[PDB]
Design a protein around this ligand. Structure first.
Ligand SMILES: [Cl-]
Ligand SMILES: [Cu+2]
Length: 122
């Protein structure tokens, strides 16, 4: 299955958001990150992807597709926008949950990640 995440200046969560900011997918599913507004990108957060996964980074304004196969959670962020974060989950019982949940980001970033994990049933 293929899924889309839009990069937006504003959403229910406030300014600078991935929408949806949380997505549960099956191994082999894909997510394309699509800038609805200019000035955004996507990249994985250091330490926040599974063993077996590769990091990634898009260019500002680039439409960017990633295939997810390694099971676990994947924290992603937008470079210019500190609170702009999201979580892609592959499978159930992710094994690297604490990598995201136990991290020490600025509060508004960390609460958005934490909300994303809780919405994914964790
Ligand atoms: Cl593009
Ligand atoms: Cu952004």
């Amino acid at each position: 299955a293929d899924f889309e995440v839009h990069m937006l200046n504003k959403g229910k969560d406030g300014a600078m958001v991935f929408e949806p900011a949380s997505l549960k997918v099956a191994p082999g599913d894909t997510v394309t990150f699509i800038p609805t507004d200019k000035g955004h990108n996507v990249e994985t957060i250091k330490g926040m992807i599974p063993d077996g996964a590769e990091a990634f980074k898009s260019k500002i304004n680039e439409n960017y597709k990633v295939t997810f196969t390694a099971p676990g959670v994947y924290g992603v962020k937008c470079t210019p926008h500190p609170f702009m974060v999201g979580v892609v989950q592959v499978g159930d019982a992710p094994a690297n949950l604490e990598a995201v949940k136990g991290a020490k980001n600025p509060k508004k970033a960390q609460e958005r990640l934490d909300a994303a994990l809780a919405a994914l049933g964790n």
